[PDB]
Structure formats: C-alpha cells, structure tokens
Design a protein around this ligand. Structure first.
Ligand SMILES: [Cu+2]
Lengths: 109, 110
C-alpha cells in the first residue's frame, strides 16, 4: 500500500467521524481505535496535517472549550460545505466501486 | 471549497488502473476505452496522465511493459503488484467495517 491510498482512506474516515458530531483530536483517535478492534491507531500528527488543510478549505471549523482536567481544548465541527464534501467523497468512492464492478463484468463477457 | 481534492482523485485513478491490469494485461488505448465504457462515458482518462502514473508504478516495481505481436505496448501487473493489490483491497474492506462500526456506535449512543 502507498501513502496515497492510506491517506485517502484516513481522510474518508475522519470526515465520517466528524459527520457524527463535534470532536477533538485525541477523542477521534480513541474512537477509531475502538471501531477498529484496536488495530487502527491514528497518529495525532497526521490529524494535525489533515485538519490544517480541511480548516483552510472550509470543510471543518473549530472553537475552544473546556476539558475535564481543567485545561482548554480545541474542538472541530463539520461545516455545511464539509457535509457536502463528505457526500461527494462518499459518492465518488461508490462511483469508483461501480466502475471496477463493470470492468469485471464486461470482462466475464 | 467542497469539491473532491486532487490527491484523493489521484488515488482513485491509480486504484482503477491497477484493477484494470489485475483483470488482464492491457495497452493504453484499450485501458482508456474500457474505463470509458465502465464509467458510462463519465471517466475519459488522458493518455499523458496514464504515462505519468505508469512511469511511477514501473519505477516502484508494481507494473511492467512488453511488446505484443505496428506493435502495441502492453502493461502488466507484476507479482509484487498483485500482492500490493491484495493488501489494498484488504484495507478497503477494513475501512468500510470501521465506518460501519462508527455509525453503529453512533446509533447506540442515541
Ligand atoms: Cu468507504
């Protein structure tokens, strides 16, 4: 596997996590670890790079709030633009799946 | 804005092209025609773009090329290419279950 497909898959995952509601970097990593039965351990540095780009693109926004130990935490939200990006990304992967399915079928024929 | 980033599209193009070669050795004009048909005309691949992609995949040992029986130049997935496609498809299925599990845990919390 090359960086690009892993990175593409991570991006798809992060958008689907943020779709569910506001979140923070360490909480996202925890949830993805749990949803992967412990196998996918995303690195916070990867999220920082991704979230920087998405914030610039207008796909996510952020705000500050409290956290439990008494400090301050940056929270992230999928914007309206970001919800459309999420839909297009999901649509695009489904179109790619269909192209390959059709390739395999036109072959058998 | 909201449109699909070019990095993700490049990943989708590579995935399509490697699946075309997994299905059988092929030449550039034939790959373009088959992808055009399989996408019902919505994906017309550019020959120069394929050469960029094929140059890197050959450098990485994922594909190779050879002459057919004007001879056409055929491209083939290498033995390493076939393995890397097995790995790629495995993660694809795993990512989909992870998203399903995230969705499923979301519904439970509600
Ligand atoms: Cu998916």
């Amino acid at each position: 596997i090359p960086k690009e497909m892993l990175r593409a898959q991570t991006n798809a995952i992060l958008l689907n996590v943020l779709k569910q509601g506001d979140n923070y970097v360490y909480g996202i990593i925890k949830q993805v670890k749990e949803a992967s039965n412990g196998e996918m351990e995303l690195n916070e540095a990867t999220l920082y790079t991704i979230f920087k780009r998405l914030e610039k693109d207008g796909i996510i926004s952020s705000y500050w709030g409290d956290e439990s130990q008494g400090g301050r935490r940056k929270y992230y939200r999928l914007t309206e633009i970001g919800h459309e990006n999420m839909r297009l990304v999901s649509e695009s992967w489904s179109r790619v799946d269909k192209i390959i399915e059709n390739l395999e079928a036109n072959k058998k024929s």
